[PDB]
């Protein structure tokens, strides 16, 4: 029949350029570093890479505050280096997905420098400027990065809106001329051959008319209210009509803060908005509302959340799947057990899950090596502007002590994912010849690409084999998904099926032996791969005995 888009069967790798590979000793990764490592990614089996922002930026949010959408970030290289990265990817049959940050720009962008000059400036309405009320801000909106989402500018006496940092003013999508500027910007990169675009905080583009105060209830989860602008889908549909309908690039949205029942509006292919969804339900399934505390959860919660997310894709939508990214703690530390004796086994188990979920998997740089959270010792060990925001909102206000913030944010911080990639065991793990912008994890002596690649029993080798198996088994990418028992908090088991072929995935999430009884009528036919198992089951088995953290993929009958 008709086939599926290349993107539904692709395995993506996310590169955070700043921490991938430095080639000039300034301690910051760059395009030349990434280009020199394309053979490494191709050898691992990667089809496409998504890079974080690579545009001109003051870096108050490491690329997410853009001052010029048509120039490359100085730290990464030049437009020539970007062009070379593209060409080398193409020589290897690989595709590039870039990050698109158009909910807001840097306050250094020329549009903002113009906007702030006067109320009658032609660019005034490229942003949101409003009078304060009752001697304070326009309304009670809080910022994700600390304090109020409203900043007064004495040049005009009004306040501008910023959901994120003070140096990331929100762009005004209710203004036609600004929407047209953004479309022309997207075409600039698409005309260069870019194959995909990831839309940063795509659900917050539409603002609420009149900016009334959030109710006390809404305030509890302000992220959600910010995703309820009345014109959101109208704007996304217009972006598709004027830009994406004219190219063959895949689009994916970072649907931050929106309730899961609204995700189909963004990804149902019939609506002509986005192709794939990046949801937060699973990766933040154990995160408190303040985003810096954790809440104990079990595998039952994990799988039940995945069931809900899969159901939302319905028949016309499509999900991405990921256990890690640049805004969350390290996969093995977060969902696995990173203790020395369990790190490799649990990282392999999580690899099995990642590569057998229904959706397009994104492997975050370093997770294929089993990289872990970083041992922060003081609040100064964090670079992340979000941690400074928590200090402002919780420590300076007396709600928590600096020690309490350190203790808790150490387990949830985005910086856990941003320590430099561990290439080998030379100075700073071969990431740089200079001083890394963020400290390298001392565990690079045990966790590094050179050692991983030379060992058939490594986490890396396991990911590589899982990727080969997935590429050879259509059911593992586009097949249906059925969780055999959503209530089981010990062993995660599900089937993937397509065209009469069914595969069974069984993953022990406990560090103790466990048993698993197959569904009535189901029996093992073959064993494709297992991790931490002393032996594959016998053909015909109606049950399995699992070692701690063991994972396996089996073709059933």
| Residues of the shown chain interacting with Ca ion in the complex, contacts defined by CB under 5 A | 22, 24, 26, 28, 30
Rounded to a whole number of angstroms, the CA Rg of the chain reads 24
| SS3 label, residue 352 | helix
508 is in an annotated binding site: no
Least distance CB 375 / Ca ion (angstroms): 25
Catalytic machinery residues:
200, 254
Of 22 and 200, CB closest to Ca ion: 22
Length of the chain: 557
Question: Annotation-wise, does 30 bind a ligand?
Answer: yes
Least distance between Ca ion and beta carbon 429 (Å)? 15
Of 19 and 105, which has the nearer Cβ to Ca ion? 19
- CA dihedral (207, 212, 215, 221) in degrees, to 10, reads 20
CA 55, CA 76: separation in Å to the nearest integer?
A: 9
**Least distance from Ca ion to the Cβ atom of residue 88, Å:** 18
Identify the helix (H) or strand (E) that includes residue 304: helix 299-313
At residue 515, the 3 state secondary structure works out as strand
425 is in an annotated binding site: no
Nearer residue to Ca ion within complex by CB, 22 or 384: 22
Three-state secondary structure readout of 391-455: HHHHHCCCCCCHHHHHHHHHHHCHHHHCCCCCCCCCHHHHCCCCCCCCCCCHHHHCCCHHHHHCC
- Residue 24 annotated in ligand binding: yes
Q: Among candidates 248, 283, 454, which has minimal Cα distance to 364?
A: 283
The answer to whether the annotation marks 306 as part of a ligand binding site is no
The residue ranges of DSSP E strands in 10-149, in sequence order, are: 12-15, 48-51, 55-56, 68-72, 95-100, 129-130
Structure tokens at 399: 């709600």
Q: What are the start-end ranges of the E strands in 57-119?
A: 68-72, 95-100
- Decide whether 73 or 236 has the Cβ nearer to Ca ion: 73
Q: How far is the CB of 326 from Ca ion (least distance, A)?
A: 18
Strand pairing class (196-199; 250-254):
parallel
Identity of the residue, 27 or 317, whose beta carbon is nearer to Ca ion in the bound complex: 27
Q: Which is nearer to Ca ion, 28 or 475 (CB)?
A: 28
Residue ranges of the annotated binding site are 22, 24, 26, 28, 30
Residue ranges of the annotated binding site for Ca(2+) are 22, 24, 26, 28, 30
């Amino acid at each position: 029949k008709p086939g599926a888009p290349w993107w539904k069967s692709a395995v993506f790798y996310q590169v955070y350029p700043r921490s991938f590979k430095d080639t000039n000793g300034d301690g910051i990764g760059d395009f030349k570093g990434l280009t020199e490592k394309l053979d490494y990614l191709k050898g691992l089996g990667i089809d496409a890479i998504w890079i974080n922002p690579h545009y001109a930026s003051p870096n108050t949010d490491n690329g997410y505050d853009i001052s010029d959408y048509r120039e490359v970030m100085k730290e990464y290289g030049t437009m020539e280096d970007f062009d070379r990265l593209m060409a080398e990817l193409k020589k290897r049959g690989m595709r590039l997905m870039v990050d698109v940050v158009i909910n807001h720009s840097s306050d250094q962008h020329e549009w903002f420098k113009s906007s702030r000059a006067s109320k009658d400036n032609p660019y005034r309405d490229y942003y949101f400027w409003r009078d304060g009320k009752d001697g304070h801000e326009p309304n009670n909106y809080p910022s994700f990065f600390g304090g109020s989402a409203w900043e007064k500018d004495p040049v005009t006496g009004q306040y501008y809106l910023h959901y994120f940092g003070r140096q990331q003013p929100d762009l005004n999508w209710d203004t036609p001329k600004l929407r047209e500027e953004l479309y022309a910007m997207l075409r600039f990169w698409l005309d260069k051959g870019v194959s995909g675009m990831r839309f940063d905080t795509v659900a917050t583009y539409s603002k609420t008319p009149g900016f009334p105060d959030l109710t006390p209830e809404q305030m509890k989860n302000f992220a959600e209210a910010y995703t309820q602008g009345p014109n959101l889908h109208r704007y996304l549909q217009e972006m598709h009509e004027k830009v994406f309908d004219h190219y063959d690039a895949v689009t994916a949205g970072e649907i931050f803060g929106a309730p899961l029942n609204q995700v189909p509006l963004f990804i149902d292919s019939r609506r002509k908005e986005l192709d794939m969804a990046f949801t937060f339900d699973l990766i933040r399934y154990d995160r408190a509302l303040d985003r810096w505390h954790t809440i104990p959860r079990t595998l039952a919660d994990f799988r039940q959340t995945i069931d809900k997310v899969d159901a939302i894709a319905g028949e016309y939508g499509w999900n991405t799947f990921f256990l890690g990214n640049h805004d969350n703690p390290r996969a093995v530390s977060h969902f696995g057990d990173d203790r020395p004796q369990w790190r490799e086994a649990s990282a392999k188990a999580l690899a099995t899950v990642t590569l057998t979920q229904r959706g397009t998997p994104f492997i975050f740089q370093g997770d294929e090596l089993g990289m872990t959270n970083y041992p922060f010792k003081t609040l100064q060990d964090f670079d992340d502007i979000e941690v400074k925001g928590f200090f402002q909102d919780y420590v300076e206000t007396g709600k928590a002590t600096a020690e309490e913030l350190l203790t808790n944010v150490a387990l949830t911080s985005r910086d856990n994912a941003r320590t430099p990639f561990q290439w080998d065991d030379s100075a700073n793990a071969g990431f740089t010849t200079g001083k890394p912008w963020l400290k390298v994890n001392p565990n690079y002596t045990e966790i590094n690409a050179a050692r991983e690649i030379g060992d058939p029993k490594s986490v890396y080798s396991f990911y590589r084999n899982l990727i080969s198996i997935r590429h050879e088994t259509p059911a593992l990418s586009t097949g249906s998904y059925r969780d055999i028992d959503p209530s089981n908090a010990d062993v995660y088991a599900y089937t993937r099926s397509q065209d009469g072929e069914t595969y069974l995935v069984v993953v022990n999430f406990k560090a103790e032996p466990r048993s698993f009884t197959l569904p009535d009528g189901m029996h093992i036919a073959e064993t494709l791969i297992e991790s931490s198992s002393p032996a594959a089951p016998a053909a015909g088995a109606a049950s399995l005995e699992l070692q701690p953290w063991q994972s396996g993929i089996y073709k059933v009958k």
